[PDB]
Design a protein around this ligand. Structure first.
Ligand SMILES: *[C@@H]1O[C@H](CO)[C@@H](O[C@@H]2O[C@H](CO)[C@@H](O[C@@H]3O[C@H](CO[C@H]4O[C@H](CO)[C@@H](O)[C@H](O[C@H]5O[C@H](CO)[C@@H](O)[C@H](O)[C@@H]5O)[C@@H]4O)[C@@H](O)[C@H](O[C@H]4O[C@H](CO)[C@@H](O)[C@H](O)[C@@H]4O[C@H]4O[C@H](CO)[C@@H](O)[C@H](O)[C@@H]4O)[C@@H]3O)[C@H](O)[C@H]2NC(C)=O)[C@H](O)[C@H]1NC(C)=O
Ligand SMILES: *[C@@H]1O[C@H](CO)[C@@H](O[C@@H]2O[C@H](CO)[C@@H](O[C@@H]3O[C@H](CO)[C@@H](O)[C@H](O)[C@@H]3O)[C@H](O)[C@H]2NC(C)=O)[C@H](O)[C@H]1NC(C)=O
Ligand SMILES: *[C@@H]1O[C@H](CO)[C@@H](O[C@@H]2O[C@H](CO)[C@@H](O)[C@H](O)[C@H]2NC(C)=O)[C@H](O)[C@H]1NC(C)=O
Ligand SMILES: *[C@@H]1O[C@H](CO)[C@@H](O[C@@H]2O[C@H](CO)[C@@H](O)[C@H](O)[C@H]2NC(C)=O)[C@H](O)[C@H]1NC(C)=O
Ligand SMILES: *[C@@H]1O[C@H](CO)[C@@H](O)[C@H](O)[C@H]1NC(C)=O
Ligand SMILES: *[C@@H]1O[C@H](CO)[C@@H](O)[C@H](O)[C@H]1NC(C)=O
Ligand SMILES: *[C@@H]1O[C@H](CO)[C@@H](O)[C@H](O)[C@H]1NC(C)=O
Ligand SMILES: *[C@@H]1O[C@H](CO)[C@@H](O)[C@H](O)[C@H]1NC(C)=O
Ligand SMILES: *[C@@H]1O[C@H](CO)[C@@H](O)[C@H](O)[C@H]1NC(C)=O
Ligand SMILES: *[C@@H]1O[C@H](CO)[C@@H](O)[C@H](O)[C@H]1NC(C)=O
Ligand SMILES: *[C@@H]1O[C@H](CO)[C@@H](O)[C@H](O)[C@H]1NC(C)=O
Ligand SMILES: *[C@@H]1O[C@H](CO)[C@@H](O)[C@H](O)[C@H]1NC(C)=O
Ligand SMILES: *[C@@H]1O[C@H](CO)[C@@H](O)[C@H](O)[C@H]1NC(C)=O
Ligand SMILES: *[C@@H]1O[C@H](CO)[C@@H](O)[C@H](O)[C@H]1NC(C)=O
Ligand SMILES: *[C@@H]1O[C@H](CO)[C@@H](O)[C@H](O)[C@H]1NC(C)=O
Lengths: 442, 130, 108, 123, 123, 123, 47, 48
């Protein structure tokens, strides 16, 4: 009985780190829910440790491709907007207006082909300031993204609201889920669970903020890789949601035209009402309390007497120096610089943010391809939660007491790293090896 | 393969310089190089060690400056996804030297999350006198 | 701020031996964020090594080097006439990054 | 009665009776080829483990016995410290670099068993 | 000498000698993805039934025996009225709602036959 | 210690000990559908041979014994000339036309054994 | 060919509910446009 | 030499030499390349 022999065991709870292919499960149309597996049933584990680590996972980098391929699939069979690149005779609509909106809302006229190729059609439309570029009385403007890209009109039948989907694993793989109250990026998890697939993950597109995301526990927690390093973004997560309200009070008109045989084009009509500017309202008291709470949370890493100073953005393109999101089918760009005022020392109104509208957008830097945004008829409103901010800090010398913090980011994976941080794909192996006193017969 | 920057411009004290560092020279090209790769700008004075000047991210051209050259350095790219620029206002007779632009993944790629400047491009010279 | 210094500033060697390019760090480098560059006067400064010890694409078998903590060494196996040029080491981490001063090999 | 992967943090002496909850779940447009790639990989990963257990004389069993002696160079641990304290995850990390020889050593115990029985059956 | 699915209407006592023709036919552009799904689905449907028979101690057999007793609450019929008058289609409809309780009960008889045989072989 | 397909020209009496190296290597964009068909074809070709060996009472074994006698009309060669002189490639060409009758005669020996064992175990 | 006859068995056959007459209706309209993809698009005829 | 049949003059004759013999050719013109934009998003590189 002393001479031990080796035995193999089938169906043994042991796993390894591996990457695999996740599929969709979610239960007119949207970009995602067209062909997915119809869907809880969790299993809790006890006193087993696991080294959870984000920013090196294989789930936030597969989703970054599974979102852009799904976006290209919803943009391929639509109408290709080739003949729009003509000379646009374009002047200022609503002249001598003493309001703020002066440079935008330009009226341009151009020729467009119809179903009969020998005949043309003169059409009138309104385009924003970020949609027309002058080229060398009325001036002759052209499109913004024509000389380096080919714009395609998006399909008006599909919608752009984020339907919550689930990334689900096949047989042989599992998803470890950390169920800790406080949990930073890299480290052990005291209580894990084995899940097939997760809760509602909203694939919302947003920069400089985290709209309609998952909530947190009773305390605000910050997350970074090596936060003394000022190169990685700081993914904070608020404990209570703060609401932002913005509408578009100009009454819209959407007019239809036929550019060719079988195709269609929905363009901007007139404005029947008042020429106003869209603006997002936030409550000042709870936002100031949230800023004080996240400053008190961030003060646990840099001592007591260090002056934390919130500042505005650095610059670059429009998707970092402003905040961009998607409301109902329209893409907004608001400056949000009224939320990062003067600094913080230890010893009933509403804040408005001016927000503009750009039709031609270019998401995920697809060179050679661009999408057109059709207008939405009527007044459209959007109320949104804010669960999480995107902050980064700068460097400095040794004698520096004013630690600055600017809202940057811009990475689309950071919006999916605040909702897939507590999940980890894992591959189980059913072959176990153990010695015992057993011996087979002859 | 290699990056391309041109310019042998002389300058006067009190002006601004513009250095464009493009990848694949033909203008109508879609390299996609300025798209998933960070880009470092590095100055070097003759008889002096080279110092860092500024990195630009490939996500939406969000720049990260240093504290020495903060208030007088703007840099971004145009509407096309090539040809990042370098505008250094507030000149001085101290920064006379060569300039370099290098490609760097900066730990954002899929294999191994490395930290290396795999290719440097050209190297222009900026002098200033009166 | 971590200052990066190099004590062998002037070096001279014959073609066909091993040379040691040492570098001292200030306070506790992370042993995975360091790079070496081969500079020259009016040429293209290329890279020779990744991190601690990992070769690049255009790098032969004769280039290597290791080190951890605050000391980092570059160990060239053999000396060629196409390698007599100055070398510059740099680190990574918090902005701004700082180079390692400067060293130079020579023929004698 | 623990569930799928329920005894992963338990003792190896207590996890040897719940081997069926992990052995029965190994088999159970853009997404047209995404869902098809997993149904081939799971079947291949199940069939590889079924082929590895078929050439050891353990095809159809969960806890089988072999004639290969356990060497002391792989692990110097006794019986009272493995099946009473260690879990199945801590034991796999100790013999992780010895899997490629034992899987060879379990092969020669098969061909030396089927041949020496074969001339026993020809008499 | 009946053929594939030839004894589907015969007696269960006479259809137990022709189980081989139903167990050997389970494995044997627009149409590029249509033909590829069938070769995955048939392999998966065969491997599911091969996995369900491998964890019951019946891997490699057709008519095996178990130790689970037959409860009288499922059916009150005797041996003389099942294997002499009823076919398989009329028998499958009578115990169609008791399949999920037998398939678990056949599982716990495996480890109970595997654990008690383990320590008997360790002596 | 020969390798994969190393004993292909060797003696059948000497190649019967190296049956492990051939039984373990059966499992291990324009090219997106080209690589997907090959794994499905390999899985089907492995599962067909695993199904043919599971209905003969030889599941999990490499060298098994059957009850079907060897007819003299298939080959008139003795034992001293088959396992000493001929290889497997020269032997497969001699019974290349008598495969489907041996494959049919091997199927009834499973049922004629299983029914008798079921009648013996019912007492 | 190669048919197999059966005895002593009845089956509840039912048309207007089968999944074969609704799969063929999709397979025909999915094969109709496949023979029109490499052909010439008749765009400039509408004069 | 290799062929399907030597006496059949319809099949090709593939020969294989024992030593590699070199062949050098250049294009001695400079052949500058110019570009033009043919439409939205495309490119056209023509002869200079
Ligand atoms: C973060 O999350 C929050 C969630 O809290 C998001 O906020 C919501 O965002 C959605 C975006 O889709 C908003 O939905 C839109 O609401 C529009 C306003 O309609 C409301 O007012 C009318 C007034 O009569 C009510 O009737 C509506 O009630 C409807 O819903 C209830 C639900 O029970 C039904 O019972 C009713 O019968 C109504 O059906 C709303 O309260 C609304 O117009 C809009 O609907 C258009 O789009 C859909 C999808 O395409 C069409 O099916 C529909 O017919 C509408 O179509 C328009 O365009 C076509 C173009 O041809 C025209 O022909 C039509 O006439 C019409 O003009 C849509 O449903 C929602 O209001 C909003 N708030 C709340 C509290 O839910 C944030 O957006 C999100 N932030 C992000 C993602 O950044
Ligand atoms: C994140 O970045 C920080 C800052 O670079 C890293 O901390 C550094 O860690 C090293 C050890 O790997 C420390 O070096 C040690 O220094 C002491 C003397 O101070 C010496 O006695 C030791 O033998 C060792 O060399 C270094 O001091 C430390 N730097 C700071 C500022 O604390 C850290 O490793 C990085 N990674 C993480 C947190 O995962
Ligand atoms: C967002 O708001 C800020 C603050 O109002 C704007 O910053 C102004 O920028 C101009 C440009 O030179 C300065 O002359 C002003 O002094 C700045 N304002 C203040 C109060 O300092 C900024 O332009 C706005 N827009 C964007 C896109 O950031
Ligand atoms: C494509 O068109 C855009 C829009 O005009 C060009 O962007 C402008 O380029 C000029 C070059 O003299 C700059 O002065 C402007 O500041 C640019 N406008 C911006 C950045 O909004 C772009 O250069 C064109 N691309 C070409 C010709 O390749
Ligand atoms: C984990 O919990 C189980 C019962 O829940 C217990 O038997 C076991 O000893 C525990 N392990 C440790 C290391 O405490
Ligand atoms: C449309 O074409 C006619 C043809 O001559 C031209 O006169 C007119 O100016 C064009 N329209 C615009 C807006 O340029
Ligand atoms: C995460 O939190 C734990 C708990 O205090 C700590 O030990 C660990 O160092 C933290 N890791 C990081 C990267 O902040
Ligand atoms: C925003 O909209 C919500 C919707 O109910 C409303 O309760 C709230 O008063 C509005 N204003 C602010 C400042 O939150
Ligand atoms: C924000 O909250 C703090 C609470 O510490 C309070 O002192 C301060 O007056 C509030 N308002 C502003 C504008 O900081
Ligand atoms: C900063 O102040 C808080 C007050 O609660 C204290 O707990 C903490 O220890 C202080 N930080 C340092 C580094 O002393
Ligand atoms: C923030 O508010 C203060 C209050 O007076 C104001 O002075 C400052 O200009 C504001 N910040 C911005 C960016 O407008
Ligand atoms: C906008 O214009 C339409 C056009 O008929 C009108 O019916 C509607 O009342 C107007 N106002 C709003 C708020 O939609
Ligand atoms: C914001 O969060 C609260 C928290 O429960 C939720 O009730 C509300 O619906 C959220 N608002 C949204 C999703 O617009
Ligand atoms: C079918 O039924 C008849 C009488 O009902 C019986 O004689 C016969 O054996 C049965 N089976 C077949 C295969 O005909
Ligand atoms: C060609 O021939 C030379 C010398 O005969 C040889 O060195 C070389 O490897 C050959 N192949 C190529 C591709 O140059």
């Amino acid at each position: 009985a002393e001479n031990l022999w080796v035995t193999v065991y089938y169906g043994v709870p042991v796993w390894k780190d591996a990457e695999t292919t996740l599929f969709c499960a979610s239960d007119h149309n949207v970009w995602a829910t067209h062909a997915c597996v119809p869907t809880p049933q969790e299993i809790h584990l006890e006193n087993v440790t696991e080294e959870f680590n984000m920013w090196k996972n294989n789930m936030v980098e597969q989703m970054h491709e599974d979102i852009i391929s799904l976006w290209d699939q919803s943009l391929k069979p639509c109408v290709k907007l080739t003949p729009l690149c003509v000379t646009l005779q374009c002047t200022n609509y609503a002249p001598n207006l003493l309001s703020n909106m002066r440079g935008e809302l330009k009226q341009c006229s151009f020729n467009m082909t119809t179903e009969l190729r020998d005949k043309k059609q003169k059409v009138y439309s309104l385009f924003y300031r970020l949609d027309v570029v002058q080229i060398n009385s009325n001036k002759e403007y052209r499109l913004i993204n024509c000389n380096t890209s080919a714009i395609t009109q998006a399909c008006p039948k599909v919608s752009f609201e984020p339907i919550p989907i689930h990334y689900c694993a096949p047989a042989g793989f599992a998803i470890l889920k950390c169920k800790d109250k406080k949990f930073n990026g890299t480290g052990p998890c005291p209580s894990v669970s084995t899940v097939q697939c997760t809760h509602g993950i909203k694939p919302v597109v947003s920069t400089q903020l985290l709209l309609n995301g998952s909530l947190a526990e009773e305390e605000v927690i910050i997350r970074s890789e090596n936060i003394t390093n000022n190169a990685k973004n700081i993914l904070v997560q608020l404990n209570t949601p703060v609401q932002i309200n913005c509408t578009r009070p100009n009454n819209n008109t959407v007019k239809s035209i036929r550019i060719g045989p079988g195709q269609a084009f929905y363009y901007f009509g007139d404005i029947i009402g008042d020429i106003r500017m869209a603006h997002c309202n936030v409550s000042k008291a709870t936002w100031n309390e949230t800023l004080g709470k996240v400053v008190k949370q961030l003060r646990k890493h840099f001592g007591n007497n260090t002056i934390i100073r919130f500042a505005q953005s650095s610059g670059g393109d429009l998707e970092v120096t402003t905040h961009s999101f998607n409301c109902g089918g329209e893409f907004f760009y608001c400056n949000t610089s009224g939320l990062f005022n003067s600094t913080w020392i230890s010893n009933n109104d509403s804040i408005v943010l001016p927000c503009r509208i750009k039709q031609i957008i270019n998401m995920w830097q697809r060179i050679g391809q661009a999408m057109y945004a059709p207008p939405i008829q009527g007044v459209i409103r959007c109320v949104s939660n804010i669960t999480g901010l995107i902050l980064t800090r700068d460097g400095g010398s040794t004698n520096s007491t004013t630690e600055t913090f600017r809202p940057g980011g811009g990475d689309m994976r950071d919006n999916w790293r605040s909702e897939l941080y507590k999940y980890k794909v894992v591959k189980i192996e059913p072959l176990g090896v153990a010695p015992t006193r057993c011996k087979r017969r002859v | 393969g290699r990056l391309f920057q041109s310019g042998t411009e002389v300058k006067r004290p009190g002006a601004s310089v513009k250095i464009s560092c493009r990848a694949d020279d033909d203008p109508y090209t879609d390299d996609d190089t300025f798209t998933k790769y960070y880009t470092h700008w590095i100055r070097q004075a003759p008889g002096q060690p080279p110092e860092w000047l500024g990195v630009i991210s490939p996500h939406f051209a969000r720049p990260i400056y240093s504290y020495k050259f903060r208030d007088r350095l703007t840099l971004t790219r145009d509407s096309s996804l090539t040809a990042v620029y370098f505008e250094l206002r507030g000149l001085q007779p101290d920064d006379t030297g060569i300039y370099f632009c290098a490609r760097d993944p900066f730990g954002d790629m899929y294999p191994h999350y490395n930290y290396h400047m795999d290719v440097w491009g050209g190297g222009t010279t900026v002098i200033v006198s009166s | 701020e971590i200052v990066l210094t190099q004590s062998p500033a002037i070096l001279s060697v014959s073609p066909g031996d091993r040379v040691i390019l040492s570098c001292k760090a200030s306070e506790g480098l992370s042993s995975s964020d360091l790079a070496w560059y081969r500079f020259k006067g009016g040429q293209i400064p290329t890279l020779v090594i990744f991190g601690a010890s990992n070769r690049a694409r255009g790098t032969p078998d004769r280039f290597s080097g290791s080190g951890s903590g605050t000391d980092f060494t570059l160990t060239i196996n053999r000396v060629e006439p196409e390698d007599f040029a100055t070398y510059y080491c740099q680190r990574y981490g918090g902005t701004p990054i700082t180079f390692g001063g400067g060293t130079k090999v020579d023929i004698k | 009665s623990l569930g799928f992967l329920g005894a992963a943090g338990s003792t190896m002496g207590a996890a040897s009776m719940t081997l069926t909850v992990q052995a029965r779940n190994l088999l159970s447009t853009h997404w047209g080829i995404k869902q098809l790639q997993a149904r081939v990989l799971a079947v291949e990963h199940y069939l590889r483990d079924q082929q590895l257990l078929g050439i050891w004389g353990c095809s159809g069993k969960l806890i089988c016995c072999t004639n290969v002696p356990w060497n002391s160079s792989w692990s110097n641990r006794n019986l009272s410290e493995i099946w009473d304290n260690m879990t199945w995850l801590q034991w796999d990390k100790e013999i992780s670099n010895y899997t490629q020889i034992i899987y060879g050593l379990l092969e020669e115990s098969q061909n030396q068993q089927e041949k020496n029985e074969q001339d026993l059956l020809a008499l």
